[PDB]
Amino acid sequence: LGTATGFDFELIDQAGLGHEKLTQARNQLLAEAAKHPDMLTSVRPNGL
Amino acid sequence: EDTPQFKIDIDQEKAQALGVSINDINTTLGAAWGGSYVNDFIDRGRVK
C-alpha cells in the first residue's frame, strides 16, 4: 500500500512536448510547491 | 464481382540468364507497386 496524509501525483505531457519540456514543467511545479510550507511538505520527484 | 486484374508473368530462366535474382525482382515489383513497411521512426515522441 501507500501512506496516509500523502498523495501520489502524475505530470503528463499530452501534446508531444518532449523530455526537456517536461522537466522544465516539473521544476516549475516543485519550486512553486515549495512556497506553500503550511500546506505541502516533502514534495519531490520520484524518478531520477 | 470478379474484376479485370493484371497478371505479370516473370520468367526465371530468362532472369537467371541476365544476372538478376527473383529476390529483388519481386521486391522492386512489390515495394514500388504495393508498398513496403521498412522500420519505425519517432514522430513527436511516438513510434510510427
Side-chain angles (χ1 to χ4, degrees):
Chain A
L1 289 177
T3 186
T5 310
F7 56 90
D8 190 65
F9 183 77
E10 290 289 332
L11 195 66
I12 320 295
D13 51 351
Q14 306 187 3
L17 295 177
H19 180 70
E20 64 188 1
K21 293 289 185 67
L22 189 63
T23 309
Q24 293 179 358
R26 197 270 310 273
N27 294 325
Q28 175 180 356
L29 188 65
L30 296 175
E32 189 67 30
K35 67 181 71 174
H36 291 85
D38 54 354
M39 181 66 75
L40 297 174
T41 58
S42 300
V43 58
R44 66 190 179 275
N46 199 6
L48 298 174
Chain B
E1 302 178 358
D2 46 354
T3 72
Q5 66 196 5
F6 186 74
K7 170 72 174 177
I8 188 168
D9 197 1
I10 302 297
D11 190 1
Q12 304 190 7
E13 176 183 359
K14 197 181 266 80
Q16 178 61 253
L18 292 173
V20 291
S21 64
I22 59 170
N23 285 316
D24 60 350
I25 288 169
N26 296 319
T27 303
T28 302
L29 180 65
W33 295 85
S36 178
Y37 164 66
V38 177
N39 56 2
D40 295 330
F41 82 111
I42 297 295
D43 193 9
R44 277 81 53 87
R46 186 174 177 87
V47 174
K48 294 181 183 178

Coordinates of all heavy atoms in Angstrom, one line a residue:
Chain A
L1 N 0.8 -1.2 0.0 CA 0.0 0.0 0.0 C 0.9 1.2 0.0 O 2.1 1.2 -0.1 CB -1.0 0.0 1.2 CG -2.1 -1.0 1.2 CD1 -2.9 -0.8 2.5 CD2 -3.0 -0.8 0.0
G2 N 0.2 2.4 0.2 CA 0.9 3.7 0.2 C 1.0 4.2 1.7 O 1.6 3.6 2.5
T3 N 0.5 5.4 1.9 CA 0.6 6.1 3.2 C -0.6 7.0 3.3 O -1.3 7.4 2.4 CB 1.9 6.9 3.4 OG1 1.9 7.4 4.7 CG2 2.0 8.1 2.4
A4 N -0.9 7.3 4.6 CA -2.0 8.3 4.9 C -1.3 9.6 5.1 O -0.2 9.7 5.6 CB -2.7 7.9 6.2
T5 N -2.1 10.7 4.8 CA -1.7 12.1 4.7 C -0.5 12.2 3.8 O 0.7 12.4 4.2 CB -1.4 12.7 6.1 OG1 -2.5 12.4 7.0 CG2 -1.2 14.2 6.1
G6 N -0.7 11.8 2.5 CA 0.3 11.8 1.5 C -0.4 11.4 0.2 O -1.3 10.7 0.1
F7 N 0.1 12.0 -0.9 CA -0.5 11.8 -2.2 C 0.5 11.3 -3.2 O 1.6 11.0 -2.8 CB -1.2 13.1 -2.7 CG -0.3 14.3 -2.8 CD1 0.4 14.6 -3.9 CD2 -0.2 15.2 -1.7 CE1 1.3 15.7 -4.0 CE2 0.6 16.3 -1.8 CZ 1.4 16.5 -2.9
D8 N 0.1 11.2 -4.4 CA 0.8 10.5 -5.5 C 0.4 11.0 -6.8 O -0.7 10.6 -7.3 CB 0.6 9.0 -5.3 CG 1.5 8.1 -6.1 OD1 2.7 8.2 -5.9 OD2 1.0 7.4 -7.0
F9 N 1.2 11.8 -7.4 CA 0.8 12.8 -8.5 C 1.5 12.5 -9.8 O 2.7 12.1 -9.7 CB 1.1 14.2 -8.0 CG 0.7 15.3 -8.9 CD1 -0.7 15.6 -9.0 CD2 1.6 16.0 -9.6 CE1 -1.0 16.7 -9.8 CE2 1.2 17.0 -10.4 CZ -0.1 17.3 -10.5
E10 N 0.8 12.6 -10.9 CA 1.4 12.4 -12.2 C 1.5 13.7 -13.0 O 0.7 14.7 -12.7 CB 0.7 11.4 -13.0 CG 0.8 10.0 -12.5 CD 2.2 9.4 -12.8 OE1 2.9 9.9 -13.7 OE2 2.6 8.5 -12.0
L11 N 2.3 13.8 -14.0 CA 2.5 15.0 -14.7 C 2.7 14.6 -16.2 O 3.8 14.3 -16.6 CB 3.8 15.7 -14.1 CG 4.0 17.2 -14.5 CD1 2.9 18.0 -13.9 CD2 5.3 17.6 -13.9
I12 N 1.7 14.7 -16.9 CA 1.6 14.1 -18.3 C 1.9 15.2 -19.3 O 1.3 16.3 -19.1 CB 0.3 13.4 -18.5 CG1 -0.2 12.7 -17.3 CG2 0.4 12.4 -19.6 CD1 0.6 11.5 -16.9
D13 N 2.7 14.9 -20.3 CA 2.8 15.9 -21.4 C 1.9 15.4 -22.6 O 2.3 14.5 -23.3 CB 4.2 16.1 -21.9 CG 5.0 14.8 -22.1 OD1 4.5 13.7 -21.7 OD2 6.1 14.8 -22.6
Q14 N 0.7 15.9 -22.7 CA -0.3 15.4 -23.6 C -0.3 16.1 -24.9 O -1.4 16.2 -25.6 CB -1.7 15.5 -22.8 CG -1.6 14.8 -21.5 CD -2.9 14.7 -20.8 OE1 -4.0 15.1 -21.4 NE2 -2.9 14.2 -19.6
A15 N 0.8 16.7 -25.3 CA 0.8 17.5 -26.5 C 2.1 17.2 -27.3 O 2.5 18.0 -28.2 CB 0.7 19.0 -26.3
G16 N 2.9 16.2 -26.9 CA 4.1 15.9 -27.6 C 5.2 16.9 -27.4 O 5.9 17.2 -28.3
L17 N 5.4 17.3 -26.1 CA 6.4 18.4 -25.9 C 7.8 17.9 -25.9 O 8.7 18.6 -26.5 CB 6.0 19.1 -24.5 CG 4.7 19.7 -24.5 CD1 4.5 20.2 -23.1 CD2 4.6 20.9 -25.5
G18 N 8.1 16.9 -25.2 CA 9.4 16.3 -25.1 C 9.8 16.0 -23.6 O 9.0 16.2 -22.7
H19 N 11.0 15.6 -23.5 CA 11.6 15.3 -22.1 C 12.1 16.6 -21.4 O 11.9 16.7 -20.2 CB 12.6 14.3 -22.2 CG 13.2 13.9 -20.9 ND1 12.5 13.2 -20.0 CD2 14.5 14.1 -20.4 CE1 13.3 12.9 -18.9 NE2 14.5 13.5 -19.2
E20 N 12.8 17.4 -22.2 CA 13.3 18.7 -21.6 C 12.2 19.7 -21.4 O 12.4 20.7 -20.7 CB 14.5 19.2 -22.4 CG 14.1 19.6 -23.8 CD 15.3 19.9 -24.7 OE1 16.4 19.8 -24.2 OE2 15.1 20.3 -25.9
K21 N 11.1 19.6 -22.2 CA 10.0 20.5 -21.9 C 9.2 20.0 -20.7 O 8.4 20.7 -20.2 CB 9.1 20.6 -23.1 CG 9.7 21.3 -24.3 CD 9.8 22.7 -24.0 CE 10.3 23.5 -25.2 NZ 9.3 23.4 -26.3
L22 N 9.3 18.7 -20.4 CA 8.6 18.2 -19.2 C 9.3 18.4 -17.9 O 8.7 18.5 -16.9 CB 8.3 16.7 -19.4 CG 7.3 16.0 -18.4 CD1 6.0 16.7 -18.5 CD2 7.2 14.6 -18.8
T23 N 10.7 18.4 -18.0 CA 11.5 18.6 -16.8 C 11.3 20.1 -16.4 O 11.3 20.4 -15.2 CB 12.9 18.3 -17.1 OG1 13.0 17.0 -17.6 CG2 13.7 18.4 -15.8
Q24 N 11.2 21.0 -17.4 CA 11.0 22.4 -17.0 C 9.6 22.7 -16.5 O 9.5 23.6 -15.7 CB 11.3 23.3 -18.2 CG 12.7 23.3 -18.7 CD 12.9 24.1 -19.9 OE1 12.0 24.7 -20.5 NE2 14.2 24.2 -20.4
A25 N 8.7 21.9 -16.9 CA 7.4 21.9 -16.2 C 7.4 21.2 -14.8 O 6.6 21.6 -13.9 CB 6.3 21.3 -17.1
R26 N 8.3 20.3 -14.7 CA 8.4 19.6 -13.4 C 9.1 20.4 -12.4 O 8.8 20.4 -11.2 CB 9.2 18.3 -13.6 CG 9.1 17.2 -12.5 CD 10.2 17.3 -11.5 NE 11.5 17.4 -12.0 CZ 12.3 16.4 -12.3 NH1 11.8 15.1 -12.1 NH2 13.5 16.6 -12.8
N27 N 10.2 21.2 -12.8 CA 10.9 22.1 -11.9 C 10.1 23.3 -11.6 O 10.3 23.9 -10.5 CB 12.2 22.4 -12.5 CG 13.2 21.2 -12.6 OD1 13.1 20.3 -11.8 ND2 14.0 21.3 -13.7
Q28 N 9.3 23.8 -12.5 CA 8.4 24.9 -12.2 C 7.4 24.5 -11.1 O 7.0 25.4 -10.3 CB 7.7 25.4 -13.5 CG 6.7 26.4 -13.3 CD 6.1 26.8 -14.6 OE1 6.4 26.4 -15.7 NE2 5.0 27.7 -14.5
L29 N 6.9 23.3 -11.2 CA 5.8 22.9 -10.2 C 6.4 22.7 -8.8 O 5.8 23.0 -7.8 CB 5.1 21.7 -10.7 CG 3.9 21.3 -9.9 CD1 2.9 22.3 -10.0 CD2 3.4 19.9 -10.3
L30 N 7.6 22.1 -8.7 CA 8.2 21.9 -7.4 C 8.7 23.1 -6.8 O 8.5 23.3 -5.5 CB 9.4 20.9 -7.6 CG 9.2 19.5 -8.1 CD1 10.6 18.9 -8.2 CD2 8.4 18.7 -7.1
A31 N 9.2 24.1 -7.5 CA 9.6 25.4 -7.0 C 8.4 26.2 -6.6 O 8.6 27.1 -5.8 CB 10.5 26.1 -8.0
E32 N 7.2 25.9 -7.1 CA 6.0 26.6 -6.7 C 5.4 25.9 -5.6 O 4.7 26.5 -4.8 CB 5.1 26.7 -7.9 CG 3.9 27.6 -7.7 CD 4.2 29.1 -7.5 OE1 5.2 29.5 -8.0 OE2 3.5 29.8 -6.8
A33 N 5.6 24.6 -5.4 CA 5.0 23.9 -4.3 C 5.9 24.0 -3.0 O 5.5 23.5 -2.0 CB 4.9 22.4 -4.6
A34 N 7.1 24.6 -3.2 CA 7.9 24.8 -2.0 C 7.7 26.2 -1.3 O 8.2 26.4 -0.2 CB 9.4 24.8 -2.4
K35 N 6.9 27.0 -1.9 CA 6.5 28.3 -1.3 C 5.1 28.2 -0.6 O 4.6 29.3 -0.3 CB 6.5 29.4 -2.3 CG 5.5 29.4 -3.4 CD 5.7 30.5 -4.4 CE 7.0 30.4 -5.2 NZ 7.1 31.4 -6.2
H36 N 4.6 27.0 -0.4 CA 3.5 26.8 0.4 C 3.8 25.8 1.5 O 3.4 24.6 1.5 CB 2.3 26.2 -0.4 CG 1.7 27.2 -1.3 ND1 2.2 27.4 -2.6 CD2 0.6 28.0 -1.2 CE1 1.5 28.3 -3.2 NE2 0.5 28.7 -2.4
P37 N 4.6 26.2 2.5 CA 5.1 25.3 3.5 C 4.0 24.9 4.5 O 4.1 23.8 5.2 CB 6.2 26.0 4.2 CG 5.8 27.4 4.1 CD 5.1 27.6 2.8
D38 N 3.0 25.7 4.7 CA 1.9 25.4 5.6 C 0.8 24.5 5.1 O -0.1 24.1 5.8 CB 1.2 26.7 6.1 CG 0.8 27.6 4.9 OD1 1.1 27.2 3.7 OD2 0.1 28.6 5.1
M39 N 0.9 24.1 3.8 CA 0.0 23.2 3.2 C 0.7 21.9 2.6 O 0.2 20.8 2.8 CB -0.7 23.8 2.0 CG -1.7 23.0 1.3 SD -3.1 22.4 2.3 CE -4.1 23.9 2.3
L40 N 1.9 22.1 2.0 CA 2.6 21.0 1.3 C 4.0 20.8 1.9 O 4.7 21.8 1.9 CB 2.6 21.2 -0.2 CG 1.3 21.3 -0.9 CD1 1.5 21.8 -2.3 CD2 0.6 20.0 -0.8
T41 N 4.3 19.6 2.4 CA 5.6 19.3 2.8 C 6.1 18.0 2.0 O 5.3 17.2 1.5 CB 5.7 19.0 4.3 OG1 4.8 17.9 4.6 CG2 5.3 20.2 5.1
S42 N 7.4 17.9 2.0 CA 8.1 16.7 1.4 C 7.8 16.5 0.0 O 7.8 15.3 -0.5 CB 7.9 15.5 2.3 OG 8.3 15.7 3.6
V43 N 7.5 17.5 -0.8 CA 7.2 17.3 -2.2 C 8.5 17.2 -3.0 O 9.5 17.9 -2.7 CB 6.4 18.5 -2.7 CG1 7.1 19.9 -2.5 CG2 6.0 18.3 -4.2
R44 N 8.6 16.2 -3.9 CA 9.8 15.8 -4.5 C 9.4 15.0 -5.8 O 8.3 14.6 -6.0 CB 10.6 14.9 -3.6 CG 9.9 13.6 -3.3 CD 10.5 12.8 -2.2 NE 9.8 11.6 -1.9 CZ 8.7 11.5 -1.1 NH1 8.3 12.6 -0.5 NH2 8.1 10.4 -0.9
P45 N 10.4 14.8 -6.7 CA 10.2 13.8 -7.8 C 10.5 12.4 -7.4 O 11.3 12.2 -6.5 CB 11.1 14.4 -8.9 CG 12.2 15.0 -8.2 CD 11.6 15.6 -7.0
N46 N 9.9 11.5 -8.0 CA 10.1 10.1 -7.7 C 11.2 9.5 -8.5 O 11.9 8.5 -8.1 CB 8.8 9.3 -7.9 CG 8.9 7.9 -7.1 OD1 9.8 7.7 -6.4 ND2 7.9 7.1 -7.4
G47 N 11.4 10.0 -9.8 CA 12.4 9.4 -10.7 C 13.8 9.8 -10.4 O 14.2 10.1 -9.3
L48 N 14.6 9.9 -11.5 CA 16.0 10.3 -11.4 C 16.2 11.5 -12.3 O 15.4 11.9 -13.1 CB 16.9 9.1 -11.9 CG 16.8 7.9 -11.1 CD1 17.6 6.8 -11.8 CD2 17.3 8.1 -9.7
Chain B
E1 N -17.9 -8.5 -57.3 CA -17.9 -9.2 -58.6 C -16.5 -9.3 -59.1 O -15.7 -8.3 -58.9 CB -18.9 -8.6 -59.6 CG -20.3 -8.5 -59.2 CD -21.1 -7.7 -60.2 OE1 -20.6 -7.3 -61.3 OE2 -22.4 -7.6 -60.0
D2 N -16.2 -10.3 -59.9 CA -14.8 -10.5 -60.3 C -14.4 -9.5 -61.4 O -15.0 -9.5 -62.5 CB -14.6 -12.0 -60.7 CG -15.6 -12.5 -61.6 OD1 -16.6 -11.8 -61.8 OD2 -15.5 -13.6 -62.1
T3 N -13.3 -8.8 -61.2 CA -12.8 -7.7 -61.9 C -11.7 -8.1 -62.9 O -11.1 -9.2 -62.7 CB -12.2 -6.6 -60.9 OG1 -11.0 -7.1 -60.4 CG2 -13.2 -6.4 -59.8
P4 N -11.3 -7.3 -63.8 CA -10.1 -7.5 -64.5 C -8.9 -7.2 -63.6 O -8.9 -6.2 -62.8 CB -10.1 -6.5 -65.7 CG -11.5 -6.2 -65.9 CD -12.1 -6.3 -64.5
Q5 N -7.9 -8.0 -63.7 CA -6.7 -7.8 -62.9 C -5.5 -8.2 -63.8 O -5.6 -9.0 -64.7 CB -6.7 -8.6 -61.6 CG -6.7 -10.1 -61.8 CD -7.2 -10.8 -60.5 OE1 -7.5 -10.2 -59.5 NE2 -7.1 -12.1 -60.5
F6 N -4.3 -7.6 -63.5 CA -3.2 -7.5 -64.4 C -2.1 -8.5 -64.1 O -1.2 -8.2 -63.2 CB -2.7 -6.1 -64.5 CG -1.6 -5.9 -65.5 CD1 -2.0 -5.8 -66.8 CD2 -0.3 -5.7 -65.1 CE1 -1.0 -5.5 -67.8 CE2 0.6 -5.4 -66.0 CZ 0.3 -5.4 -67.4
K7 N -2.2 -9.7 -64.7 CA -1.2 -10.8 -64.4 C 0.1 -10.4 -65.1 O 0.2 -10.3 -66.3 CB -1.7 -12.1 -65.0 CG -0.7 -13.2 -65.0 CD -0.4 -13.7 -63.6 CE 0.5 -15.0 -63.7 NZ 0.9 -15.5 -62.4
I8 N 1.2 -10.3 -64.3 CA 2.5 -10.1 -64.8 C 3.3 -11.5 -64.6 O 3.1 -12.2 -63.5 CB 3.3 -9.0 -64.1 CG1 4.6 -8.7 -64.8 CG2 3.5 -9.1 -62.6 CD1 5.2 -7.4 -64.4
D9 N 4.0 -11.9 -65.6 CA 4.5 -13.3 -65.6 C 6.0 -13.3 -65.7 O 6.6 -13.2 -66.8 CB 3.8 -14.0 -66.8 CG 3.9 -15.5 -66.8 OD1 4.5 -16.0 -65.8 OD2 3.5 -16.2 -67.7
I10 N 6.7 -13.5 -64.6 CA 8.1 -13.5 -64.5 C 8.6 -14.8 -65.1 O 8.1 -15.9 -64.7 CB 8.6 -13.2 -63.1 CG1 8.1 -11.9 -62.5 CG2 10.1 -13.3 -63.0 CD1 8.6 -10.7 -63.3
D11 N 9.6 -14.7 -66.0 CA 10.3 -15.9 -66.4 C 11.6 -16.0 -65.5 O 12.3 -14.9 -65.4 CB 10.7 -15.8 -67.9 CG 11.3 -17.2 -68.4 OD1 11.4 -18.1 -67.6 OD2 11.6 -17.2 -69.6
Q12 N 11.9 -17.1 -65.0 CA 13.0 -17.2 -64.1 C 14.2 -17.9 -64.8 O 15.4 -17.8 -64.3 CB 12.7 -18.0 -62.8 CG 11.5 -17.4 -62.1 CD 11.4 -18.0 -60.7 OE1 12.2 -18.8 -60.3 NE2 10.3 -17.6 -60.1
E13 N 14.0 -18.5 -66.0 CA 15.2 -18.9 -66.8 C 15.8 -17.6 -67.4 O 17.0 -17.4 -67.4 CB 14.7 -19.8 -67.9 CG 15.8 -20.1 -68.9 CD 15.4 -21.0 -70.0 OE1 14.3 -21.4 -70.1 OE2 16.3 -21.3 -70.9
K14 N 14.9 -16.8 -68.0 CA 15.4 -15.6 -68.7 C 15.9 -14.5 -67.8 O 16.7 -13.7 -68.2 CB 14.2 -15.0 -69.5 CG 14.5 -14.0 -70.6 CD 13.3 -13.5 -71.3 CE 13.0 -14.3 -72.5 NZ 12.3 -15.6 -72.2
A15 N 15.5 -14.6 -66.5 CA 16.1 -13.7 -65.5 C 17.5 -14.2 -65.0 O 18.4 -13.4 -64.8 CB 15.2 -13.6 -64.3
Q16 N 17.6 -15.5 -64.8 CA 18.9 -16.2 -64.5 C 19.9 -15.9 -65.5 O 21.1 -15.8 -65.2 CB 18.6 -17.6 -64.2 CG 19.9 -18.5 -63.9 CD 20.6 -18.1 -62.6 OE1 21.6 -17.5 -62.7 NE2 19.9 -18.3 -61.5
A17 N 19.5 -15.9 -66.8 CA 20.5 -15.6 -67.9 C 20.9 -14.1 -67.9 O 22.0 -13.9 -68.5 CB 19.8 -15.9 -69.2
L18 N 20.2 -13.2 -67.3 CA 20.6 -11.8 -67.3 C 21.4 -11.4 -66.0 O 22.0 -10.4 -66.0 CB 19.4 -10.9 -67.4 CG 18.6 -10.9 -68.7 CD1 17.4 -10.1 -68.6 CD2 19.5 -10.4 -69.8
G19 N 21.4 -12.3 -65.0 CA 22.1 -12.0 -63.8 C 21.3 -11.4 -62.6 O 21.9 -11.1 -61.6
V20 N 20.0 -11.3 -62.8 CA 19.1 -10.9 -61.7 C 18.6 -12.1 -61.0 O 18.6 -13.2 -61.6 CB 17.9 -10.0 -62.2 CG1 18.4 -8.7 -62.7 CG2 17.3 -10.7 -63.3
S21 N 18.3 -12.0 -59.7 CA 17.6 -12.9 -59.0 C 16.1 -12.5 -58.8 O 15.8 -11.4 -59.1 CB 18.2 -13.1 -57.6 OG 18.1 -12.0 -56.8
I22 N 15.3 -13.4 -58.4 CA 13.9 -13.1 -58.1 C 13.7 -12.6 -56.6 O 12.6 -12.3 -56.2 CB 13.0 -14.2 -58.4 CG1 13.4 -15.5 -57.6 CG2 13.0 -14.6 -59.8 CD1 12.4 -16.5 -57.6
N23 N 14.8 -12.5 -55.9 CA 14.8 -11.9 -54.6 C 14.8 -10.4 -54.6 O 14.6 -9.7 -53.6 CB 15.9 -12.4 -53.7 CG 15.7 -13.8 -53.2 OD1 14.6 -14.2 -52.8 ND2 16.8 -14.6 -53.3
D24 N 15.1 -9.8 -55.8 CA 14.9 -8.4 -56.0 C 14.1 -8.0 -57.2 O 13.8 -6.8 -57.4 CB 16.3 -7.7 -56.0 CG 17.1 -8.1 -57.1 OD1 16.8 -9.1 -57.8 OD2 18.2 -7.4 -57.4
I25 N 13.6 -9.0 -58.0 CA 12.6 -8.7 -58.9 C 11.3 -8.5 -58.2 O 10.6 -7.5 -58.4 CB 12.5 -9.8 -59.9 CG1 13.6 -9.8 -60.9 CG2 11.2 -9.7 -60.7 CD1 13.7 -11.1 -61.8
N26 N 10.9 -9.4 -57.3 CA 9.7 -9.3 -56.5 C 9.7 -8.2 -55.5 O 8.6 -7.7 -55.1 CB 9.4 -10.7 -55.8 CG 9.2 -11.8 -56.8 OD1 8.6 -11.7 -57.8 ND2 9.8 -13.0 -56.5
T27 N 10.9 -7.8 -55.1 CA 10.9 -6.7 -54.1 C 10.7 -5.4 -54.9 O 10.0 -4.5 -54.4 CB 12.3 -6.7 -53.4 OG1 12.4 -7.9 -52.7 CG2 12.3 -5.6 -52.4
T28 N 11.4 -5.2 -56.0 CA 11.2 -4.0 -56.8 C 9.8 -3.9 -57.3 O 9.2 -2.8 -57.4 CB 12.2 -4.0 -58.0 OG1 13.5 -4.1 -57.5 CG2 12.1 -2.8 -58.8
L29 N 9.2 -5.0 -57.7 CA 7.8 -5.1 -58.1 C 6.9 -4.8 -56.9 O 5.9 -4.0 -56.9 CB 7.4 -6.4 -58.7 CG 6.0 -6.7 -59.1 CD1 5.6 -5.8 -60.3 CD2 5.9 -8.1 -59.5
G30 N 7.2 -5.4 -55.7 CA 6.3 -5.3 -54.6 C 6.4 -4.0 -53.8 O 5.4 -3.4 -53.5
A31 N 7.6 -3.5 -53.6 CA 7.8 -2.2 -52.9 C 7.4 -1.0 -53.7 O 6.9 0.0 -53.1 CB 9.2 -2.1 -52.4
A32 N 7.5 -1.1 -55.0 CA 7.0 0.1 -55.8 C 5.5 0.1 -56.0 O 4.9 1.1 -55.7 CB 7.6 0.0 -57.2
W33 N 4.9 -1.0 -56.4 CA 3.5 -1.1 -56.7 C 2.6 -1.3 -55.5 O 1.5 -0.9 -55.5 CB 3.3 -2.1 -57.8 CG 4.0 -1.8 -59.1 CD1 5.3 -2.0 -59.4 CD2 3.4 -1.1 -60.2 NE1 5.6 -1.5 -60.6 CE2 4.5 -1.0 -61.2 CE3 2.2 -0.6 -60.5 CZ2 4.2 -0.4 -62.4 CZ3 2.0 0.0 -61.7 CH2 3.0 0.1 -62.7
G34 N 3.1 -2.0 -54.5 CA 2.3 -2.3 -53.3 C 2.7 -1.5 -52.1 O 1.8 -1.1 -51.3
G35 N 4.0 -1.2 -51.9 CA 4.4 -0.5 -50.8 C 5.1 -1.5 -49.8 O 4.6 -2.6 -49.6
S36 N 6.1 -1.0 -49.1 CA 6.8 -1.8 -48.1 C 7.0 -1.1 -46.8 O 7.3 0.1 -46.8 CB 8.2 -2.1 -48.7 OG 9.0 -2.9 -47.8
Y37 N 6.7 -1.8 -45.7 CA 7.0 -1.3 -44.4 C 8.4 -1.7 -44.0 O 8.7 -2.9 -43.8 CB 6.0 -1.9 -43.4 CG 6.4 -1.8 -42.0 CD1 6.5 -0.5 -41.4 CD2 6.7 -2.9 -41.2 CE1 6.9 -0.4 -40.1 CE2 7.0 -2.8 -39.9 CZ 7.2 -1.5 -39.3 OH 7.5 -1.4 -38.0
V38 N 9.3 -0.7 -43.9 CA 10.7 -0.9 -43.7 C 11.0 -1.0 -42.2 O 11.4 -2.1 -41.7 CB 11.5 0.2 -44.3 CG1 13.0 0.1 -44.1 CG2 11.2 0.3 -45.8
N39 N 10.8 0.0 -41.4 CA 11.1 0.0 -40.0 C 10.3 1.1 -39.4 O 9.3 1.6 -40.0 CB 12.6 0.1 -39.7 CG 13.3 1.3 -40.3 OD1 12.7 2.1 -40.9 ND2 14.6 1.3 -40.0
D40 N 10.6 1.5 -38.1 CA 9.9 2.5 -37.4 C 10.8 3.8 -37.3 O 12.0 3.7 -37.5 CB 9.5 2.1 -36.0 CG 8.5 0.9 -36.1 OD1 7.7 0.9 -37.0 OD2 8.5 0.1 -35.1
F41 N 10.1 4.9 -36.9 CA 10.9 6.1 -36.6 C 10.1 6.8 -35.4 O 9.1 6.3 -35.0 CB 11.0 7.0 -37.8 CG 9.8 7.9 -38.1 CD1 9.9 9.2 -37.9 CD2 8.7 7.3 -38.7 CE1 8.8 10.0 -38.2 CE2 7.6 8.1 -38.9 CZ 7.7 9.5 -38.7
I42 N 10.6 7.9 -35.0 CA 10.0 8.7 -33.9 C 9.4 10.0 -34.5 O 10.1 10.7 -35.1 CB 11.0 9.0 -32.8 CG1 11.5 7.7 -32.2 CG2 10.4 9.9 -31.7 CD1 10.5 6.9 -31.5
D43 N 8.1 10.2 -34.2 CA 7.4 11.4 -34.7 C 6.8 12.1 -33.5 O 5.7 11.7 -33.0 CB 6.4 11.1 -35.7 CG 5.9 12.4 -36.4 OD1 6.5 13.4 -36.2 OD2 4.9 12.3 -37.2
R44 N 7.4 13.2 -33.0 CA 7.0 13.9 -31.7 C 6.9 12.9 -30.5 O 6.0 13.1 -29.7 CB 5.7 14.6 -31.9 CG 5.8 16.0 -32.6 CD 5.9 15.9 -34.1 NE 4.8 15.2 -34.7 CZ 3.7 15.7 -35.1 NH1 3.4 16.9 -34.9 NH2 2.8 14.9 -35.6
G45 N 7.8 12.0 -30.5 CA 7.9 11.1 -29.4 C 7.0 9.8 -29.5 O 6.9 9.1 -28.5
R46 N 6.4 9.6 -30.7 CA 5.6 8.4 -30.9 C 6.3 7.6 -32.0 O 6.8 8.1 -33.0 CB 4.2 8.8 -31.3 CG 3.3 7.6 -31.5 CD 1.8 8.0 -31.7 NE 1.0 6.9 -31.9 CZ 0.4 6.3 -30.9 NH1 0.5 6.6 -29.7 NH2 -0.4 5.2 -31.2
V47 N 6.3 6.3 -31.8 CA 6.8 5.3 -32.7 C 5.8 5.2 -33.9 O 4.6 4.8 -33.7 CB 7.0 4.0 -32.1 CG1 7.4 2.9 -33.1 CG2 8.1 4.1 -31.1
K48 N 6.2 5.6 -35.1 CA 5.4 5.5 -36.3 C 6.2 4.8 -37.4 O 7.4 4.7 -37.3 CB 4.9 6.9 -36.7 CG 4.0 7.6 -35.7 CD 3.5 8.9 -36.2 CE 2.7 9.5 -35.1 NZ 2.2 10.9 -35.4

